[PDB]
Amino acid sequence: ADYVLYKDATKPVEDRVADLLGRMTLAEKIGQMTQIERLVATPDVLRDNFIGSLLSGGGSVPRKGATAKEWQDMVDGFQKACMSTRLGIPMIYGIDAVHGQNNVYGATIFPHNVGLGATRDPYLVKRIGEATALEVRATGIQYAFAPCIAVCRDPRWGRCYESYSEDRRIVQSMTELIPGLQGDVPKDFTSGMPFVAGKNKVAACAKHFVGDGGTVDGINENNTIINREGLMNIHMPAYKNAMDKGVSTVMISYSSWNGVKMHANQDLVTGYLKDTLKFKGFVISDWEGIDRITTPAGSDYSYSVKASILAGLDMIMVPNKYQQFISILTGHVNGGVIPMSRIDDAVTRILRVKFTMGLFENPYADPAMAEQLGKQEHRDLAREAARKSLVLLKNGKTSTDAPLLPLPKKAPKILVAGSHADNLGYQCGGWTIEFQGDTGRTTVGTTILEAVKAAVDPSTVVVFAENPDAEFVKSGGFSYAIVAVGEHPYTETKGDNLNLTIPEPGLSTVQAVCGGVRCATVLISGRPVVVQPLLAASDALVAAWLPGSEGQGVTDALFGDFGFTGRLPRTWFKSVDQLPMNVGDAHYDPLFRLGYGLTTNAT
Ligand SMILES: CO[C@@H]1O[C@H](CS[C@@H]2O[C@H](CO)[C@@H](O)[C@H](O)[C@H]2O)[C@@H](O)[C@H](O)[C@H]1O
């Protein structure tokens, strides 16, 4: 009697979309296109403005240390308000689960993407997507702003660690994250259609469209200076692979392509992504990305709304001034500046994703999934990934020396040292707990020092000293040392760095240690950094990138349980004066070329 077709789970998605769209008011439509921060959301706001989506931006959590159930109860509280609207359209909640569900205390933290590139193991990355989707659903969240498919062309960019590689082919291969997060697409699948398998999967997001990895001087907020040919040949291809794998959403770059702001680029967003690649999911802005269309940012927000929505963006990550956004867009539609056809297209795409993914059938969190958070199988996977990511750059000072690695687990006394040997937050890097990461024991994990203590024979005495002097080392009766140093956590706008040298004490500790005893240096970094001096001092040196919460991945290789297999996914420069300098360039003079990596055999 009271049958409503969009509420019928047995109906085809396109019929449900069209049935719902035909019923919606303009307020209901513009609400769907609006994404807000949890920080500004209340039940009344969500209901009264018919809100379509929420997010947690970096560090946006219900409280420090919050359990999986606390996150579920948060998300469900917001959902209950959404489901209480006239039409009962469930919100989608988005988060940056970019190396695990990394805002959440106790989530497994996987290596960052640059290290995943070093594994050259797309099936490993798919399995990471799988595990990540489980840990995201453990917290009640249904959408991950991942993968970042940037092709970072200059390691001075502060997000270079979010790129699998400077080589688009490796980036393309690691789009296997998508069917991990979302599920494998049907055999009959049409490229560009969105797909999510159901309540144990999440919607994914290929980001940031397009050429975010190309930006002049590394910088971003900035211009990506190259022609159609290098756009199409370097920066774009992985977006086609993402279409073929049913990526549900695409996020637009803050960047510009040849002086045109991506958030205002109709030719690329509508002409290419939608009309040429036949993308049928939704296009989301970046954080205040429409604001940044103008200079200064936010100085003509009316223009920002007109320009972005006419360019083809579907959902706007406001994320705070939702009343201004909705008011302005409403005015634009009432005035005929934005046609109803454009609103209807945006809403069609958002609804298409929501229906496809089963969000109308399972709008609420599954309490039984809470135990997927930080689950030990997932940590075992992260430990495998971390080990596979390690690139061995040196293993002996001369070709006649005994190879230092693998180290024996049985020795009378060994030294573990360095700023990075017992600091979980430094080993995770940015996008861990906080936006910019943090120092010290910020989540559940195993530092390098703890990993060493867990690996060695019970007779081996392990001494830790963060920054020992040369005399301490020479007097200590050590068999060897493991010294871990490197970069502090960062994101784009502390991490855009011109000198790329590691902070002190880092080199000075390696010199003091290695001057006294043979030493294996573990370099923790988001990118290649100035390395000759560290190499000169070290018997062995490993580029461990940002390996995440499972430090036993490092020791699994140091102690020979597995052989080193990682290969550089980026060029290692001799000097920052050379940059940009990528594989295949004409003037190509690397310290280590892309693909370089020494090996060991398991003992
Ligand atoms: C600096 O202010 C903080 O910015 C971060 C990153 S900006 C933008 O954020 C999106 C949603 O988190 C990410 O998917 C995207 O990759 C980033 O470019 C933001 O997360 C914080 O919320 C904001 O305080």
Author numbering: 0 to 602
Extract from the study:
In the barley β-d-glucan glucohydrolase, a glycoside hydrolase family 3 (GH3) enzyme, the Trp286/Trp434 clamp ensures β-d-glucosides binding, which is fundamental for substrate hydrolysis during plant growth and development. HvExoI folds into a two-domain structure consisting of an (α/β)8 barrel (domain 1) and an (α/β)6 sandwich (domain 2) with a 13 Å-deep active site pocket embracing the subsites −1 and +1, positioned at the interface between the two domains. HvExoI catalyses the hydrolytic removal of nonreducing glucose (Glc) moiety from a broad spectrum of poly- and oligomeric β-d-glucosides. The crucial role of substrate binding in HvExoI implies a pair of the aromatic Trp286 and Trp434 residues that form a clamp at the +1 subsite, which is positioned next to a pocket-shaped site at the −1 subsite, housing the Asp285 and Glu491 catalysts.
G6SG-OMe bound tightly to native and WT recombinant HvExoI with the respective Ki values of 0.1 ×10−3 M and 0.2 ×10−3 M, hinting that this thio-analogue should be observed in the active sites of WT and mutants. This is what we indeed observed in WT, and the W286A, W286Y, W286F, W434A, W434F, W434H, and W434Y mutants, where well-defined electron density maps of G6SG-OMe and tight H-bond networks that were formed through eight to ten residues (Asp95, Lys206, His207, Arg158, Tyr253, Asp285, Arg291, Glu491, Trp286, and Trp434). As expected, the (1,3)- and (1,4)-linked thio-inhibitors were less potent with tested mutants, while the most effective thio-inhibitor was G6SG-OMe, except that it did not bind to W434A, and compared to WT, it showed 8- and 6-fold higher Ki constant values with W434H and W434F, respectively. We noted that the quality of the G6SG-OMe electron density map slightly declined in W286Y but that these maps were well-formed in W286A and W286F, suggesting that in the W286Y mutant the process of ligand-binding in (or near) the active site may have been perturbed. These findings reinforce the conclusion that G6SG-OMe binds in HvExoI regardless of mutations (particularly into aromatic residues) of Trp286 or Trp434.
